[PDB]
From a paper:
[name] (plasmin- and fibronectin-binding protein A) is one of the most recently identified surface attached pneumococcal proteins. Recombinant [name] was found to bind to the human extracellular matrix proteins fibronectin and plasmin with high affinities (KD of 4.1 and 2.4 µM, respectively), and may therefore be classified into the microbial surface cell recognition adhesion matrix molecule (MSCRAMM) family. Mutants of [name] R6 lacking the [name] gene were deficient in the capacity for adherence to, and invasion of, human epithelial cells.
Therefore, diffraction data from the C2221 crystal form that contained only one monomer in the asymmetric unit was ultimately used to complete and refine the atomic model of [name]β to Rwork and Rfree values of 20.9 and 25.3%, respectively. [name]β possess a distinct groove on its surface that is conserved in location with the substrate binding grooves of β-helix carbohydrate-active enzymes. The [name]β groove is most pronounced over ∼28 Å, up to the blind ending, and over this stretch is lined with a distinct series of electropositive residues (H293, K320, K327, H377, R405, R431, K444, K471, and R474) and tyrosine residues (Y378, Y401, Y441 and Y443). Thus, though [name]β displays significant structural similarities to polysaccharide lyases it does not appear to share their function.
Author numbering: 139 to 559
Write the structure that this text describes.
Amino acid sequence: TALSVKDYGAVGDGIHDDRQAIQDAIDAAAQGLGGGNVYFPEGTYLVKEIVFLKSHTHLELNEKATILNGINIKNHPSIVFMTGLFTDDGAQVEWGPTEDISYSGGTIDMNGALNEEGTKAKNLPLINSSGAFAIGNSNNVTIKNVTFKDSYQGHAIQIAGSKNVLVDNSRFLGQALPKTMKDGQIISKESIQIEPLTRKGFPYALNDDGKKSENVTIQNSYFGKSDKSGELVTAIGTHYQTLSTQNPSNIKIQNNHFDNMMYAGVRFTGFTDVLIKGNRFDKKVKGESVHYRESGAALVNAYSYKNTKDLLDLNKQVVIAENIFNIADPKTKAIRVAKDSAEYLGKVSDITVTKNVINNNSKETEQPNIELLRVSDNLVVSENSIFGGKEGIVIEDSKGKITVLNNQFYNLSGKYISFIK
Ligand SMILES: [Ca+2]
């Protein structure tokens, strides 16, 4: 059995800085004591600086254990757990490889709920963003049964340059968005981020070689609002790639429930070999939502980074199977896969959208249910079933073997299928 965090001087309270005590537990487990295991019994554990995870350690937390984020330093990350060293900006360090870390149970309160004004986080006034994990250059990482409360315009989890990562049976509740944020900064806030390892993408380290993430599964988890703040913008994805980034591959997103996102459940550019299967996406009406995007939304959005100069490795091998969407927002698309402008040099291909079910019961629906745009070869769109809305399927400017077979369309007002030239 495990090194207890209390034995190392963590006090259960709102108030005492437990950073050191917790770090000391971890450092001892790292050596092999308590057999790599660390246990957090019931409490609220305030940390006022970053805690470092260590190779071959396994943390388990009581259901009534919370980690409370009290990192409140100007020009400094406010991320509770990192898999490598960070002190201050401009003192970044290469992160060596780390492996075999597991983290299980309890809450992390990322503590970013807004002030009564809505310009800054109540308890963490000096910060620019809050979040729970920065996983860079790691292997075999399990995050399981955890409740993630209230990131402040930030990524609850960042998975950068990391292999064999699992997110299981967790919940993500609350993303806090200042009134002042422009749309471009809002939609870059994925709650779980899966990205190549670059300094621009992952500013916590020196690693800049663009190494991919690999074999990354997000499953059996729930994403929505909290009591203290509104709905996640984008549950899972990424919004950056370049000629030097190697594309995150074998990405499985399965059996999750994306409850009323502002923008997306899954939105990404630069992935290869992804599976989005048996998920549930709900989107409520503007009126029943704390957060809502007036420029509109797309629950699955496999899109193409804005570059007109380079031949990018754009999305390939995306499978979107057996999901179900209930949409009551007239402004929301269920499924979008795109090369967004004819001006982009890369190709998007091997795209299969199958056995999905969409109930769109919105009033005066302004959007198509499924949109495939500039897909170059191997496109299958099959045995999907679509209940309600204006247009059904739209396939636009697509070359190659295109299979469209045995879809069903019900009580749609506008065009079922629609091929555009
Ligand atoms: Ca520091």
